[PDB]
Symmetry: D6
Subunit: 169 residues, 12 copies
């Protein structure tokens, strides 16, 4: 598996990944639905550093998934992490490798201090995946985000740069 910076040609893949996520899609904190809306927003934020995205491909260049770093704050050296694996490739064992490649980039190239992510409390499976990748819960946000017209509680988990880089030393 390979992480490649997002290109214009990858926007179709991005649009298709939102097929039945049953939630409003956002591009640099701006909502969109159509492909033409997405392409206009991509042209607008092509140099915006607030968010960073990587397309995950395999040896045969099949589009496996998407790695996103959003809310990139260079003051506090923080960023939020989101990973989306295409439905067809969700049951193969790629999540852990992609989470670690994303953490390596965040902590070695972006030189960030802290990476955090949000997981729905009703999704306990994801909590253990991220716990097994080194993340630890730092918050249980009450009625944080709306899903299907009802407020949900969300867990916030984190991992620090010093731990990730010096874990085996």
């Amino acid at each position: 598996l390979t992480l490649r910076a997002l290109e214009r040609g990858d926007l179709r893949f991005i649009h298709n990944l939102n097929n039945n996520r049953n939630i409003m899609s956002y591009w640099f904190e701006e909502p969109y639905e159509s492909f033409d809306e997405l392409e206009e927003l991509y042209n607008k934020h092509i140099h915006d550093n607030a968010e960073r995205r990587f397309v995950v491909e395999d040896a045969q260049k099949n589009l496996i998934g998407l790695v996103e770093l959003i809310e990139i704050n260079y003051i506090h050296r923080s960023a939020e992490f989101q990973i989306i694996i295409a439905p067809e490739h969700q049951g193969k064992g790629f999540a852990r490798t992609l989470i670690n490649r994303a953490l390596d980039y965040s902590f070695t190239i972006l030189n960030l201090h802290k990476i955090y992510l949000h997981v729905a409390v009703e999704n306990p499976k994801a909590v253990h995946l991220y716990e097994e990748c080194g993340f630890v819960e730092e918050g249980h946000l009450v009625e944080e985000r709306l899903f299907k017209g009802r407020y949900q509680d969300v867990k916030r988990m984190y991992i620090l740069q010093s731990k990730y880089l010096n874990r085996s030393e």
Copy 2:
């Protein structure tokens, strides 16, 4: 079940323009009048990411164009919107209306998280009034000489449905 709602794209504008044929009323795009296709496309480029209105192309499994679902006057302060549905003449008497109305309500109340959807129906179209009544809408107003149609003012019923009613159904 076979019907699908898809966000409007540029290639769908020809369908929009054709839907205006023999409707005997000036067409508007984000409250701006237009008649020609080139006027429509220019207004589409201008409001590509204006969120005051949202439109969805309704297709069947064979990708035949069935109709259009419009959400206009989207007010994010009061969390309300006006709903219009236009079924192509060749598909107008096949019973698609009720399904599309519920799809529109689902998106309005679960993705846009709106509080109230309202719609206006000509008083001289009592069957449309009863169709929306059977889909959950209730009359909240009988607006006198509200709108001009073919050079003469006409009364219209304003009917509403609240998010609380649709979600607890």
Copy 3:
């Protein structure tokens, strides 16, 4: 009493009229709180025809109140009416005269077809005032607007140009 078009020098009066209305103030559908915000919005919409405002003064040029015409639609020739009387001059008997002067302008100078207004159902006193000025209820809007964090029902009342101008003939 005299109706005078609003001027920049009247913005202080506008700002003071919102002292304890316990609701967000809007200028051409844009929210504001501070005076500097209001003055910037006034410079922005100085030629916008969507709204029209008149300052009510007495013989000694005391600022009595404000007459507002908003949602001015020149397609349907409609407009919404709002009248605000300063607290000190609320118990003197000016409301009726100002409502009629406003209707005269709306129907003779703007040549509008219909004037409507919204009254809180919990404010029955205002309903009878407007009923005594010729307005008639055309709707009981359910949970229309938010006040103090709770949705309210609002009555919509109307008066037509033909009735007002030909009432005594």
Copy 4:
């Protein structure tokens, strides 16, 4: 049979050809032009201007019959001036009456205008009585109103009201 379709960019060639032998300056939203490239740039400039509205007249086989123009569209006084141009080939086919009525229908039922007026040269009484038969009535005889072939001409202003055209 005849159809009225809003003017598109692809119809500008037809507009240009209709001006070939009119012996008077052509105007697009009150701006003079002659070449096709001038017209096209004026079209791009006024694509959203609502002061004028034009319709291409076609038949069942999509032949270009003529053009219906509504100019001087004043939305405060709710008035507009009406002009009709039928291509030389189809001028003697008796299409004018239908196109005048379709133009009035749009003016009074879609644009909801109050008054439609038109100007006819004093020297063409045939057109005068055609418009009279469609409902128009003379309200003025404008003296030396417009210039034609280097000489001022008088024109008849004829009008028809929405109240007359629309019968409940």
Copy 5:
């Protein structure tokens, strides 16, 4: 005695006051307005627009007598519409004839226009015969032309040509 002076920014207050009790919407270069601040910004916007030209009428002691307006100035057909407004105080002093002639002189000798027309309400025959005595002649009786107090009104269009006003 009477003087015609081009309108300046300092005269906008006079313009605003002249609109106090006319019971009709005021327009500046065909844009509606009511407040003084709206007028002033419209003045700054059209300061170089030549579609209209206005003159303040003053007396020897610099009192503001009235206003001469030339609107709809069309430089291709060489025509313009004439309006005159005399302040209520000086309306019965017999100034109108001189101001109409001074306005025509400017129109025909400075702007070199070919035709000046004006519109007079059917219900004021006094003004009709004043303009007739200054040389104007009726060329139209426009039916339900303009709106006044919520009702459509007919107006007389009156004209005078440069050829008539100018005698070598």
Copy 6:
């Protein structure tokens, strides 16, 4: 009762700038850093009607400047905001805090109609934690090494209060 909240004006910027004295942290205006007064005023002119943040000057009956109530990260999608309160040093130990916190909550929940207010407090300031707890806030997170203070990362408590709790009180 004597204290009053007033929307921020240009003339209040000197007060804002003086409030930054001896706080040992870079000041931000709509997430843009600044130190000098001229930098502040320029950023104020730029964000005069940016609604991502709202500020209120707290005064007493004698119009003495007591402090500042800030609402930042105002998110109208999730209907949430972050709350900061800065009391001038000369008024910091007089018991004004609880009153101002409730005033801020009232405006947040009755005028902005927000769903959730949250705030961040340094873990090494346990008395501030308990003050907000006594005003209705509850801890939803213990964010590890979240913010830089004097060149060293520090943990902060995230505490929240929901609109439903404050309104039904």
Copy 7:
């Protein structure tokens, strides 16, 4: 022969007509030499009324020449006339017909009052051509224009609208 308004496709012909005229070419009073300069100037003045040009073609659409009206003054209703016939078609007898077609347009469509032209004194042949087309000398301009580094005298000839239109009446 036919007079046709100049189009972009005719610019190559314009450029070729300047091959060996041994004088600086101008487009709306701006000098040019290259084709790319000419095309940029044409895009700049596409709607400028100060100059008007017509391409002269025959029945087989061969490019015969160019008719130019420059210094078009709508205040005095005047314009300067220049005619250029391609070298290959200079000895066939077209000049007179093109001069009269140009005068007809100038006096019937542009409704101009006076047309004038400039002829080099050392070119007496052209003087008699224009004299035979109705032009009369009104001036002998001394050292008016530079040609091959030396000042030349130029004759100015004119024709009025009243004469041309009423000559045969």
Copy 8:
């Protein structure tokens, strides 16, 4: 000798505007019409450094305003210009004209280094023709119905003077 030419400044525009009184001809500033002082000042700000025209205020030793020397149609390609001189009515019959004409010629031929100055004089003003003839000018044209004056076309003499003649004098 007492008379002085001074480049035009903003404070001299009132003098320019007053000079237009009772001249019975539309005034132009860089070929743009104007009547009011505010129109003049705006056009002055626009052409402050346009070199197509140059104007000089003529004063006496006591700084009384005598007149104006204008150089218009300044053509730097042909090195020519048109000369107009306007003496204030109160100074029009005192013999200043010849001195000012020579001053203007000196500046034109020694500072602007022009090759030819020309001027236009009404044929019905034969005394002005002879004054310029006595100052070195010679007639090169009798332009028929060249200019409109009080609604009627009039003939004008074009007279010239060359740099070689003035310098070798």
Copy 9:
């Protein structure tokens, strides 16, 4: 006693006067200038530019003591160059040590920078050992680095890290 205050527009006169006799071109955000009007327009241009940060040094009685400059602020490598200018009147009052420490404190606790460096002329060993006593250490001897009085000069680059200045 001494105070560091962010630079304001009113302090530009002080900046200009500090350049009077430095015999080298003055720069504002790497743009050269000499006149006060040039400085003021450069100030308006870079008012929000964060590549440089300056502080006016004042005493208790609000006398202008000097200026602390942080230039070449690189937020990716978290580095910046430090310059200090004390007015000739107060140069021998022993203020430099306190101002260097206050500048480092801001650099390492407010801007959270990792490394602060400075350049000192080889020919001034007094300043070299002052900075050494404040914690700086030489990391380079740049050969013919900068131009002074028409001749290239060598400079010592001295640095201090955040890890050293900050002791938990």
Copy 10:
């Protein structure tokens, strides 16, 4: 006689760029440096109608590219210009130089009507000095350490030729 001068077009820029090969000096376009072809084309689009410089492509009858004639520092105040000529290496010793120099002088003195052409030649290239001397140029200056060439200052001769000399030849 076979050689021809043609105004520079966009398609000739590749020739210009190739002419810069192995000249060991930074290239300039209207006094702006450039190395790459894309830099050249962008600067060409920017100065398409800048008249401070004029360039001509020299071709033979078979349309083979022979060289380039440049006129730079064109000063229309003093009516002067600097002349550079670059012959392609493959054509540099065939005797074309003298013909091209005269062609350039002809255009400079008969079409641009300039008064003086000057050129600079390296003192260490005495044969070029004598070639221009045989074409009419005369030395007016020996400029000491005027220009940098390969990192070292070099003296250059400035030689001139006046319009009066070339025309009376």
Copy 11:
């Protein structure tokens, strides 16, 4: 054999590929980027910016050998930083010496710069002595200068003057 050619738009793909496995953020005129589309827009933005100059290194058969970069070009102090990147395929072919000399030749004879410096990681002594053999000399040992793989590194700054490279 080897050629240095100014960078063109068509060479941006080569630039992007050269960054594939460098494990550090890539910069174009001090702006970070990763994707090709980001690079291309940064190229269009800085096409005329003279703060940096790059040359593509090709062989006789037009194979892409490497890249010569001159960054931090300061035209007042007449200095610039030199970087060279040879594609992995051609790294062991002994091309570096020739490319360093061709880059210096351009820097000192075309740009007429006074000083060229470069930064080399402390941990690569081979490159240090390569540059020493081409004329460079160490002027600094910058402590914790740059970040690599999440850890600060020391770098050697090496310089060469125009006076040394150019011998009359």
Copy 12:
């Protein structure tokens, strides 16, 4: 005597210095005559480095003269020098000191390589002044500049940085 960079307040002095120089004044190669033209040009080129000017004042702040550096070329490190001493202070002995102060700035602060100046051949006095300040003639430019409508020859004199700085060593 003191050299001070030019400020806006010095423009009056600049304008007065051109009173009777009988030559067109230029500001960054743009001609001007009036003060308002000069002030507009100063605002335009306030940051332009192509020219540099210094006002010469005495101890009592009397305006003595002006030092100008024009044609400042940073490629070749050259600049042209012009010095203007007010008429009242021309016979006191200031020229030499100002020329040397100007050379010191040019060679120590601007670090230029060469300074040159132009002197009219008919002004031999100035030639010896500059020769006594170290300048040497490098050219006798033939008919270089126009004065009073006739071309003049001009001497170009120069001084190099190495000579000036190392003259006494």
